[PDB]
Structure 1
Amino acid sequence: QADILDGKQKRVNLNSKRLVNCNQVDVNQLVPIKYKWAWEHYLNGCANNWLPTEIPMGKDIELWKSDRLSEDERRVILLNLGFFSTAESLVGNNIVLAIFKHVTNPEARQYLLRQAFEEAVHTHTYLYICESLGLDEKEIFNAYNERAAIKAKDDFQMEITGKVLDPNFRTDSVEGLQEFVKNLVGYYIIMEGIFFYSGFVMILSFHRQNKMIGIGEQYQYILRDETIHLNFGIDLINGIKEENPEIWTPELQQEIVELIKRAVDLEIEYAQDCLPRGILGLRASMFIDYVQHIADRRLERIGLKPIYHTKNPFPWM
């Protein structure tokens, strides 16, 4: 029996929980869980646990060090490792430094903790690949400062991670919450839902042709994780919209479509930089259609109309 009788009044009421701005209820108590979709993403993520080094790199090392890969094939591998190597850190740091603080709900935060740790595992993966192949890790991890197409994507990303980090930033104003939703869109929809996809397609294409299968298998595990990251982000954005409808104005909607169009342009320039002529039957041309196609799929998931209407040239994805 409680020896602080008044404490019983602090048990959390399910119906008082909210995704953001919830400071009327004790955020430290997990129960009763309200957003079951967040708990499900958490359990699914936990079930997907994997260790990069359980994947053998022996055949990849032999192939990489032989004369059987073309310079154009090596280029695709190097450019994608360059971009992914720090993109994980950008995403992980954003979850922690920007999102977590403002998602005032314990079960959603449970998932964020799983998500951020999975970005650490992804980072470990690129380090393992670099050291396995004998690449200079310092050069690969610094790609986003040395390769214009990668830097452009990451500089674009900063244009949204910025604001939310200010010491005085708050989500308890319509404009503060809109700014927060733009950050969620920038990281979940754009970075994780678009910027990683040309790369997934290129790397998984090697795998399908039985080349660099160790890297291919690791990217398959990463893609499995990223699918959940994206689905969680979509549910979070949709949940915040539902609980704060005054936020989802024609103006915010248009700003979001604008950010997505800009990201599509940057992702196309990145796919062209990876494929100046083409390898494995892929041509940069195909990525214009593909990047525009997934952008339409992302738009629809957060209630916006598709704008490109292009067909998917990689249905196996």
Structure 2
Amino acid sequence: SSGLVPRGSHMQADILDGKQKRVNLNSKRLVNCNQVDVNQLVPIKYKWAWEHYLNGCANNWLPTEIPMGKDIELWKSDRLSEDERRVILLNLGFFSTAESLVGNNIVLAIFKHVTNPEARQYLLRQAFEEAVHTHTFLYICESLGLDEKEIFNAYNERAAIKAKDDFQMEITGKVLDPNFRTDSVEGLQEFVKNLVGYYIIMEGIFFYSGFVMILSFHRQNKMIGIGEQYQYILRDETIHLNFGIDLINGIKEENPEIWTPELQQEIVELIKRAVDLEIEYAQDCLPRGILGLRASMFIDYVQHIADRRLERIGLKPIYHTKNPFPWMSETIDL
């Protein structure tokens, strides 16, 4: 399309004042943007957000496409230990509802206050991916003949799962309040803490420990169907986390006055609390070791990724621990 503009190829305006509402690119903002029309996608300002959207759209998969026959045979055999089963069941219990918590938070809390069409475009992709992930866990329950009411209620029945999710509810903050606003320093700091709570802590910390447990099974040729689905989930979660980081940093950069010593320290403490709860959860999963996994490795690993998340939002590492699972940064071609 480098050819001449043909005559008659523009549409005539019959509202002479309408032109003024065309969106100026440099007037667009991540939050508190009421000066321009939020319904028009164009012109795109946040290329990073649009890129995340395009990348996510290229990652389409469904749980129902992954064969579970071998997982079914292994699950029904005596070849899995009781301790191996416990790891699997606790993870399916935590994940089955965690995805709904992330998904509902995108819609009910985040979307409204991210006043930018290209970022909202990503958010709708992300929320849909959370639906696919919830579907995954129903598909696993039904494939393996598990009691799905038992699995989905896990966060009310297992203390270490509940403590993680109650912590999540607390960091959700006042954002769900219908009268909550981001057009003050306090409001915007509150909103960023929600973003840290969901992108950095829930998706960036609480999930990864489960990923290691399940992908370890996969590495050992056990439950490769569940493992393959978690691989697709991890591919999604990586983008989710990167968008969150970009959103947080962009908001900081556009509103530098919210990023105070006090807020920074508050964020570190929430992350510290999250690390402890994740370690406690890992201890509940592994009271005894399974092949290549024990609770003590998760002390180092959870602290390690916590450091990586901290750096990405401009805060200093605080644990300085080794990563006992370097294979988690392997490229998987799906």
Fold-level similarity (TM above 0.5): yes
Superposed CA offset, 1:63-89 (max 9, x none):
001100000000000000000000000
Partners of 1:230 and 1:124 lie apart in 2 by 20
Secondary structure class of the residue paired with 2:38 = coil
Write 1 or 2 for the structure with the bigger share of helix.
1
How far apart are the structure 1 equivalents of 2:116 and 2:231? 31
Alignment TM-score, normalising by the size of structure 2: 0.95
Q: Measure the CA separation in 2 of the matches of 1:105 and 1:5.
A: 26
Q: Secondary structure at the match of 2:310?
A: helix
Structure 2 gap ranges (5+): 1-11, 329-334
**Mapped pair 1:260 → 2:284:** no
Q: 1: CA distance between counterparts of 2:247 and 2:295?
A: 33
> C-alpha distance in 1, partners of 2:279/2:231?
22
- The offset of 1:162, in angstroms, is 3.7
Q: Please show how residues 1-317 of structure 1 align to structure 2 within 5 Å.
A: 1-317=12-328
Which aligned runs of 4 or more in structure 1 are off by greater than 2 angstroms? none
Counterpart secondary structure, 1:316: helix
**Cα deviation 1:174-196 (Å, max 9, x = unaligned):** 00000000000000000000000
Distance 2:216 2:16 in 1: 63
Deviation at 1:3, TM superposition (A): 0.7
**Cα deviation digits, residues 260-288 of structure 1 (max 9, x gap):** 00000000000011111111221100000
In 1, the alpha carbon distance for the partners of 2:153 and 2:289 equals 25
Q: What is the rounded CA distance, in whole Å, between the counterparts of 1:133 and 1:110 in structure 2? A: 35
* 1:9-39, Cα deviation, whole Å (9 max, x unpaired): 1000000000000000000000000000000
Name the CA distance, whole Å, in 1 between partners of 2:275 and 2:172: 18
Q: What is the CA–CA distance in structure 2 between the aligned matches of 1:211 and 1:280, rounded to whole Å?
A: 11
Q: Determine if contact 2:173/2:190 at 8 Å carries over to the other structure.
A: no
Tell me the alpha carbon deviations over residues 273-312 of structure 1, each in whole angstroms, 9 at most, x when there is no partner. 1111111221100000000000000000000000000010
Return the offset for 1:5.
Answer: 1.1
Q: Deviations over 1:80-114 (max 9, x none)?
A: 00000000000000000000000000000000000
* 1:127-169 CA-partner distances (Å, limit 9, x unpaired): 0000000000000000000000000000000002240011210
Aligned partners of 2:314, 2:178: CA distance in 1, in Å?
32
TM-score (norm 1): 1.00
Residue 309 of structure 1 aligns to a residue whose secondary structure is coil
Deviation at 1:233, TM superposition (A): 0.1
RMSD: 0.4
- The answer to whether the 8 Å contact 2:171/2:194 transfers is yes
C-alpha separation in 2, matches of 1:311 and 1:13: 47
How many residues end up aligned between the 2 structures?
317
Separation in 2 of the partners of 1:186 and 1:291? Answer: 16
Residues in 1 aligned to 2:289 and 2:61: alpha-carbon distance in whole angstroms: 32
Instruction: Return the alpha-carbon distance in structure 2 between the equivalents of residues 202 and 308 of structure 1.
Output: 22
Q: Classify the secondary structure of the residue corresponding to 2:107.
A: helix
Measured against aligned partners, the alpha-carbon deviations of 1:200-235 in whole angstroms (never above 9, x if no partner) come to 000000000000000000000000000000000000
Rounded to whole Å, the distance in 1 between the matches of 2:192 and 2:172 is: 11
Alignment partners' CA distance in 2, 1:283 and 1:87: 23
Measure the CA separation in 2 of the matches of 1:162 and 1:312. 32
* Distance in structure 1 (CA, Å) of the matches to 2:82 and 2:171: 36
State the alpha-carbon separation in 1 of the partners of residues 35 and 173 from structure 2.
Answer: 28
Give the secondary structure class of the aligned counterpart of 2:17: helix
Alpha-carbon distance in 2 for matches of 1:243, 1:16: 12
Residues in 2 aligned to 1:46 and 1:274: alpha-carbon distance in whole angstroms: 34
